[PDB]
Amino acid sequence: LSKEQESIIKLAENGHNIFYTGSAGTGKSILLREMIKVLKGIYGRENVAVTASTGLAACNIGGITIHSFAGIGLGKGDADKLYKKVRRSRKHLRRWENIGALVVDEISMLDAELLDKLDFIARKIRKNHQPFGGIQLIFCGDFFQLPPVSKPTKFAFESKAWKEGVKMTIMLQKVFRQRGDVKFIDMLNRMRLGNIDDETEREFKKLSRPLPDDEIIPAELYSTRMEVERANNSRLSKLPGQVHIFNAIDGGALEDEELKERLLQNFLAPKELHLKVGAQVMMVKNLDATLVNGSLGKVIEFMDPETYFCYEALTNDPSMPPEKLETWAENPSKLKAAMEREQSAVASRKSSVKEGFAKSDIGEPVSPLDSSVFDFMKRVVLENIKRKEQLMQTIHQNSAGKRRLPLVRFKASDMSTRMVLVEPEDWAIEDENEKPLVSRVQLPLMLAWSLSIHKSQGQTLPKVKVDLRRVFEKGQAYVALSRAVSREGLQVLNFDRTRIKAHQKVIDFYLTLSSAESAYKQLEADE
DNA sequence: TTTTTT
Ligand SMILES: Nc1ncnc2c1ncn2[C@@H]1O[C@H](COP(=O)(O)OP(=O)(O)OP(O)(O)=S)[C@@H](O)[C@H]1O
Ligand SMILES: [Mg+2]
Numbered sequence: 001l002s003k004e005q006e007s008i009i010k011l012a013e014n015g016h017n018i019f020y021t022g023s024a025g026t027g028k029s030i031l032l033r034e035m036i037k038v039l040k041g042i043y044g045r046e047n048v049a050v051t052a053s054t055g056l057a058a059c060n061i062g063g064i065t066i067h068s069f070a071g072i073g074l075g076k077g078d079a080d081k082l083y084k085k086v087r088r089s090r091k092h093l094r095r096w097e098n099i100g101a102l103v104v105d106e107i108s109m110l111d112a113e114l115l116d117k118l119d120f121i122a123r124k125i126r127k128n129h130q131p132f133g134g135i136q137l138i139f140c141g142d143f144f145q146l147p148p149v150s151k152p153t154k155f156a157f158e159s160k161a162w163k164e165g166v167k168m169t170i171m172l173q174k175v176f177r178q179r180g181d182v183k184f185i186d187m188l189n190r191m192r193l194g195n196i197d198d199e200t201e202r203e204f205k206k207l208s209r210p211l212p213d214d215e216i217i218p219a220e221l222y223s224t225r226m227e228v229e230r231a232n233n234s235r236l237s238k239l240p241g242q243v244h245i246f247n248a249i250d251g252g253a254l255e256d257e258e259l260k261e262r263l264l265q266n267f268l269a270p271k272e273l274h275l276k277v278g279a280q281v282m283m284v285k286n287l288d289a290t291l292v293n294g295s296l297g298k299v300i301e302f303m304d305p306e307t308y309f310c311y312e313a314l315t316n317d318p319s320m321p322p323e324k325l326e327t328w329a330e331n332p333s334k335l336k337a338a339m340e341r342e343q344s345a346v347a348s349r350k351s352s353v354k355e356g357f358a359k360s361d362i363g364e365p366v367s368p369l370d371s372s373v374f375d376f377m378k379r380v381v382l383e384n385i386k387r388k389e390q391l392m393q394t395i396h397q398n399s400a401g402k403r404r405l406p407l408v409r410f411k412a413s414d415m416s417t418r419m420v421l422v423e424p425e426d427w428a429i430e431d432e433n434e435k436p437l438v439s440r441v442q443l444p445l446m447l448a449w450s451l452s453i454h455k456s457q458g459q460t461l462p463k464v465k466v467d468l469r470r471v472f473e474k475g476q477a478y479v480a481l482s483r484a485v486s487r488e489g490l491q492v493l494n495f496d497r498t499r500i501k502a503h504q505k506v507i508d509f510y511l512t513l514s515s516a517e518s519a520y521k522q523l524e525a526d527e
Numbered sequence: 528t529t530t531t532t533t
Pocket of ligand 2: 060457458
């Protein structure tokens with residue numbers, strides 16, 4: 001870690017409501033990841049609230065989406081009625097009564113209206129007038145990156161809540177991401193601000209040369225959902241291995257089918273989820289505390305719940321007597337007899353709707369499980385008790401004509417993994433008398449080789465294809481291209497400098513702030 | 528042409 005950075009953790013240590021920023025690449029998130037350790041040691045592991053604007057970027061540091069944390073849904077409604085939505089769910093209310101520090105990363109994507117609301121929700125809950133109820137704030141973004149989504153949106157700082165809230169500011173300088181290319185850093189420093197010359201243009205337009213043709217799948221960054229899907233399938237249908245179709249149950253009672261379709265998209269769920277063995281996926285609904293919107297991962301193989309109950313126990317003891325896997329692979333009546341022991345009335349009218357999802361293929365045969373699924377065991381001639389894989393594969397050949405679901409290896413930003421067999425979820429849009437106008441049961445997955453540029457903001461991409469065809473917001477081009485470590489590993493199609501421009505309030509804001517060294521002097525102000 | 532909801 002640098003010297004300019006440690007003066008921030010230690011500023012946040014001493015308890016100051018800092019916002020802190022810097023060019024893309026300057027290691028603000030990495031910094032934050034360690035800052036979060038030393039704020040749980042002050043308040044409590046359960047009293048620090050790690051969040052970001054999006055949900056993938058929120059996983060970059062360990063956190064849930066800011067909206068998921070506060071418990072405000074999409075947070076469109078009035079500032080007063082969000083308070084009563086919060087104080088209903090007991091979990092979310094005391095989550096606001098105990099947090100000592102609220103962390104928000106890539107706050108650039110939050111709009112002044114919500115920052116005003118959270119500020120209010122906290123004050124009326126915590127019984128305190130202080131700029132957020134006394135909650136130590138830590139805002140970490142870069143206002144030259146993507147601005148808050150509008151459907152006019154004032155920036156996070158135009159709010160009364162921000163300029164009341166932020167007590168202190170800092171500003172990092174050394175761009176670490178492209179550290180070995182002092183030229184490429186420069187090219188992005190002036191793409192961030194609005195200036196591009198010929199040598200920049202020609203160099204970027206030279207990057208459209210195809211990327212290396214090795215066995216590492218390059219990441220692709222398109223500005224739209226229907227590009228991201230074109231590339232997520234342009235790439236998936238190049239993967240060796242048998243596909244698995246996943247058809248989404250739909251309903252139920254709306255008449256305008258054009259909005260029905262459009263409603264059926266923003267659920268983040270596709271009508272046709274195609275998934276092979278080895279696809280990069282990303283959870284899209286907040287399921288639990290560590291499997292959330294934005295969790296990258298990979299698909300491992302496709303098993304039904306009877307099967308996966310063996311494979312799960314088989315991960316917890318590869319030194320297991322196989323006389324019990326053989327009791328399940330020669331009599332699968334006893335198989336259910338151990339699965340049930342470990343596990344509403346409107347949920348029983350959606351189980352039997354989710355029950356139909358991915359109908360059983362009693363006429364299609366069941367291919368064997370891959371090699372890599374039993375690699376975990378392969379780590380002394382008398383200990384080769386591995387009739388286990390032949391037992392496990394036998395248990396799989398008993399699940400033809402049974403719904404097989406994706407077993408996904410998920411990966412957190414602290415580098416630990418977690419396997420889960422992904423069950424369908426349900427997306428409904430309804431009214432006061434509960435009738436789902438549009439309802440859809442699909443898997444909470446989408447291919448995650450291509451992110452949007454919004455979702456990729458905050459990422460650090462080793463080999464990244466970028467296509468500036470359909471960018472429409474200031475700095476968005478600068479995000480997609482600055483997600484790159486180098487130039488040797490970067491493709492740039494349809495480079496268009498004729499719309500690469502700055503916003504005026506972003507120049508106006510980064511002239512009234514404290515530099516990296518104007519963070520040190522406030523340390524001897526404490527001491 | 529975008530994100531956000533257990
Ligand atoms: N002190 C450091 N020493 C070595 N590598 C660093 C250091 N700080 C950052 N990096 C590298 O820089 C990248 C991480 O920088 P980030 O923390 O992601 O900054 P940032 O996320 O680009 O800022 P954004 O995009 O505005 S959220 C990784 O490749 C790190 O290995
Ligand atoms: Mg980041």
